Amino acid sequence: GLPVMTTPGSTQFLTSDDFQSPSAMPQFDVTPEMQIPGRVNNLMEIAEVDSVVPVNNTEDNVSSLKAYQIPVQSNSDNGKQVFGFPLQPGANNVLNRTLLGEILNYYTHWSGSIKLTFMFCGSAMATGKFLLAYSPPGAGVPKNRKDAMLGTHVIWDVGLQSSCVLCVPWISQTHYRYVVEDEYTAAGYVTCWYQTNIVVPADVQSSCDILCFVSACNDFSVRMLKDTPFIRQDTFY
Amino acid sequence: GLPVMTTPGSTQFLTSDDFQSPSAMPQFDVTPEMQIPGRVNNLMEIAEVDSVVPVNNTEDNVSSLKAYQIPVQSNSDNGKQVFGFPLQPGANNVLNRTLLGEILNYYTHWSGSIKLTFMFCGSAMATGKFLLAYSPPGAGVPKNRKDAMLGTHVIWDVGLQSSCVLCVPWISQTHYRYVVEDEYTAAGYVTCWYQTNIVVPADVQSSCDILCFVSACNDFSVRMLKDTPFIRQDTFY
Amino acid sequence: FCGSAMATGKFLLAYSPPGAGVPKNRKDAMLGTHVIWDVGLQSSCVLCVPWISQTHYRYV
Amino acid sequence: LSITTPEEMIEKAKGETAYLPCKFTLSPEDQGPLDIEWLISPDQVIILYSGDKIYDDYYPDLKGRVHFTSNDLKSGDASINVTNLQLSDIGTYQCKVKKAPGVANKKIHLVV
Amino acid sequence: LSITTPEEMIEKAKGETAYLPCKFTLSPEDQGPLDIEWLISPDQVIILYSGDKIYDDYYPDLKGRVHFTSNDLKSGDASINVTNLQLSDIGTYQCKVKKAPGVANKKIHLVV
Amino acid sequence: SDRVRSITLGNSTITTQECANVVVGYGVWPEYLKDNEATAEDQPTQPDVATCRFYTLESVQWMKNSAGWWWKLPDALSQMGLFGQNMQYHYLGRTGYTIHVQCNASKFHQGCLLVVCVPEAEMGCSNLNNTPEFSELSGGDSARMFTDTQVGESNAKKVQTAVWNAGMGVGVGNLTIFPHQWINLRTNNSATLVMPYINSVPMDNMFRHNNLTLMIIPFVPLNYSEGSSPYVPITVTIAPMCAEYNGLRLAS
Amino acid sequence: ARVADTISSRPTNSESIPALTAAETGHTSQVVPSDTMQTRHVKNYHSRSESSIENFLCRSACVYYATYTNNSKKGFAEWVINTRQVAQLRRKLELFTYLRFDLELTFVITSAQQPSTASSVDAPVQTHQIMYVPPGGPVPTKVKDYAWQTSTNPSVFWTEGNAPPRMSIPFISIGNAYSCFYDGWTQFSRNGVYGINTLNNMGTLYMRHVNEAGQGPIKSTVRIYFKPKHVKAWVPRPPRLCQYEKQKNVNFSPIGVTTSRTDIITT
Amino acid sequence: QVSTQKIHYTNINYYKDAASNSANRQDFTQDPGKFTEPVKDIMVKTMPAL
Amino acid sequence: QVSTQKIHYTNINYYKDAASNSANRQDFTQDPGKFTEPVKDIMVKTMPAL
Amino acid sequence: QVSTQKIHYTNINYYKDAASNSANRQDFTQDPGKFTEPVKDIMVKTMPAL
16 A cells, blocks of 8 residues: 555546556457568658649649740840749748648748759740849848849759759847747748840740759758648538 | 554645755756856845935926935025934835845745935035934934934034945834834834035025935844735736 | 046047048038047047158148 | 734713724735724624725714824724714723634724 | 728818728639628618629718728728718728638727 | 056947946856857857947936936847947847946036946836836837826826836835946946846847846936036946847847 | 855944945945944844745636536637736736746536426436647537547546546747737737737637536536746736736726825824 | 655656656755956955945 | 655555556657668768769 | 555655655654653662662
8 A cells, every 4th residue: 555646647648648558359469561562761851852833823823734834035124023922932832832841830940941943844945034033021021133133042053953952041139930920920922033035046935934843951840740720621421 | 563643734735845855857967067157046146235225205296306405505594304204114105116126025024224325416616514323113203403403413514525324223112123113113204304404606606415325234134024016916927 | 638637428430531521410421431539538649641642742 | 913902991071072993904915995883782883994095974873973093004093083972872882803814803892 | 801990089170072992902712702781880781892883872961971982902901081070970990801712800899 | 546447348448547346247248158158059240349339329408306216228229330230130139248337527526426237127117006117118229217206197108117126116226136336426437337248048139028127226316516517427338248139030 | 055144244434335325327236234234243043045036936827717508508618728817916927027837737527407398307417528729730620520539639527426537738839938928019010909829729629518408498607827937037017906807918097106194194 | 766755755757758747846056246246347245345 | 666756756666567567657669760761772961962 | 755654665756845754653762751751860770769
């Protein structure tokens, strides 16, 4: 008869407890394991895979394959914009349903930097240059090329190699950032501008298209697991 | 099946218990700490800061800055009193709302000695002398300078340096003292008397003012934490 | 300061390099090189203007 | 809370002014609001003190004849001055003070 | 949920168009459906916004005279434009927004 | 001796004949951001001569019926040269200040000031449900002043300027727990504080968050006889120490 | 952690004056009572243990209580977690500017019968569910819904007649310390509300019954109790004098410094 | 694991987190020098201040 | 038996099965190279890809 | 920690206070000489008292 006293917090069912439990079928021998290829060990081995970013929604391309293409045509005037969006990878409706965005909508805080792989899926004799700018917040969106070249930017040329990875850095006052749309920890905007035109020879089509990927760096991290807002239910199937 | 017996005192919720508890979010990694300047480690690093003592209430100066000033004028007759109050640093309504008095109104017992920093905030060519007396209890308040100079007192002269710290000692029969108004452990009175007049040259104002601080020594201590009587409530905000 | 003994004050001794005009407010002159002089027992203050020029010499 | 002498006998003459004392001290637990009553049984209240304001029109035979004495009622003074004593003022007077969590009585027997 | 200025006084003239602002921000816990009301007490609803569709035939004296202003109501705009102000439009207007688990009010006093 | 100091910084120099000792923060000196504490992913810029100099704000007249003044500290330096231009093009930035306030009178005036530097000074509005706006809370290099009378209820968005509550609902006698000094015209002439970077995050934006507040409150009011000089001005000088920035963008 | 002792002294007469000083330099004097009188060597055995931070703050206090009726539609209680609503705890927190602590949430749940109409009512023991939602998760609207069960938010299930439930929450913040005060807006155009920060959001708490309406409505009531542990405080602050009025802002009405007395020499 | 109280007592950590431990209640250190004397030039008690 | 937490803690197995133990929560290993670079010829960062 | 009873028994202190321990019940010491003979000159049994 050892004397004990029961602390508060007993006879409860916490849904994230770590306790042992008596087995139902004792002395069960499981079937032995196998070297199945492709063992995932961490969910940060999924954010380091690229996925195409549907950056061309516009209410008519959402139910199609046109949502992944950015139309790039041989313009007549110079210094025009190609696209642009704020960088909220759990709150914006462009980086939402990508492979990175459906991992961040299980967690609450995130950190680290983001890679943005582009690809010129155009013709072979058509060349050009692009300016991939990322402006940190505090001001509005940039509106001219003269205002966007002050931020962080690379200048991309298309040749034999047809990719360019703008790696946006981690410039923030806090050690983490929310995934829901907040104003305190916004992460600026990412734009893309014509440097020169898209020149093209005779008897070639003009409107070349560009794809865009997204991925995480080697130093990405998350925190505070929550439940997703993307799946509803009203009955049992 | 180890045999146990539950002592009385189980299945209760004591509001000052020290027990472990299962976490809700396991394997959480907190954000790392920072060398923020000004780390407080003990609440006896707050009572060793001076604060101005509102010793001039008189029902008209309470809603003003006049409550901190002691009017000191060039008197005509000699041996008059400047101020006076009993030394109950949680019970009197002069040492109540100071920085020392709003720490002692979280505890019940106190001990140690008290410093009383004064400061002559007058002109530069006006001199004078003051007598800062502290009389232990048992008798009434002193009423003449002849009765107050028998206690513990310093004689303050104003010159280049313009401060004088009367350090009242710890003279009490008990090892502690209450903070509420009791008659058993009262701590006497502190008065202040004109030694000589305040002389002054021509074309200078006469009514110089004096500020008064209060602080604790290096050997102050408290006990028996309670809840304060200064903040009421009737609803949720 | 060749004044009285009980009179005090403070002064701002500014030197502005060329390129702009003369300064016109105290807000414009405190951007240059300046010392802030107090008068007390000692009654002097030596603003030492530096040698800020593109050339190794200067005309008279 | 404790009164100095919870019962005594006071002997005065007619036309004089009675002085019924009621003093107390304060134990450290007493932190609530103050309350002071006075009774008579020749159980009718004759004066009150609650919420810092005096209410004193309660007994018709003693209308405008009884007052508190001191100006410092929160220091241990609850004495009243009965002016113009008459023959019909015979009865036990009860000084009920109630500062929570304390309570005390004082039965003053007044015979003229 | 929080409105910029929960009460003020607006002074306009007759025949003009009033502009009663109601802006807000969004704390991160607010994830439910949106709800926007407007009241009057010269406690009658004058406009609604729930389920992404506007219902606006509620007050007979203001029939077809009040409209929302912006096209981006889920960004922190709830201002209304009161056209053709008359003398009988005196009363406190109440902008009630309720996105769960948040709720806020704004009592706009309009005097012409 | 022990009365004279001469603090210099960059291309300026503040000298004082009569002043007390200098008080430095909570016991630390403003140094650069160490690599263990940083969180930004790029390299900072350190001008270090273009910012670290003594800017001078406007002056205020100390009348007899004065109340007090306050400045919001990384907002008064918004137009002062290369500090005000590096604050706009960047996004982050940490600072450490060296506040200096000076007010001279003769041996015949009497009075006493209190110079305190309050971190995170939230002020109270006039109406209990509103919040004060930006134009009535601080000014570019212009001191906002307290009053000696409670602000009426008819105002919509105005700061409560009751001086015995110091605007923040706190007793003004307890304000000495912050780093502070006293200006006393009997024995002192100039007060000086050194304030390190005090914030819960290692770097912060500077247009949205004023993380210091220099308050000046006269306890003993100014008083003299007829025949003395009636105009006594106060003038404050602030110099940022060891500043650095991050995150270029457009102007705003 | 004993306090300092006191050493004896002799009647001196010399040039070294320990009592005269100057408070202009912001330096609170460090004198001992052995410098202005004659003392005896007192062995001193007091302790400064109960004045530390971990003995001043680690005590449980109520933060909120809400009631909810079993026989109702939308009968359930939501509450965003914040310290600002009670006043006996809030004044203890604003002594310091930056705090850092974990938390031990504890609930005390009581029930009461409503004046029902049905005859010979009898109910078995009830069950309560206290769901904790981190900031951003999907929240439920009605009580009979599938978002209550089918979720990975950490909830706790409790039945009556047992010990009160208790869960522990670590330091969930984005900065390095909770900010008790935030002077400056949250939008870069400097418009809108004043002191609203996104540095001390901890989430909401959703509480409801699990049983169904058998014969008689039951109105419950649940109190929530904090307990900060491992606390580190920074940059102290003078204590709040005027009364609180709102939970978000710091606004107030002016009042005098202290209660008055009759005359400056009245003891 | 085993330490003294205010004789000894035995304390074992059970859960494998850090926020699950009991309160320390024995962090006895103080340093009031960063509030009383936050000055640059050092100040002696016996000598005059100026 | 005794290991560190996120100081130490003590864990004892009681039941004599394998499915009765508590969750590990401390299997900290990762290898993203089988998803990022699943190629045959190795690829350097600095050199061009073709 | 382990001592004899009125065979042995094992007692462990759990809480980290001093007022939380159980009662001692084994403080067996007495000295009646300060009540029976509180005198200055010592007194022998066998000799006469005066």
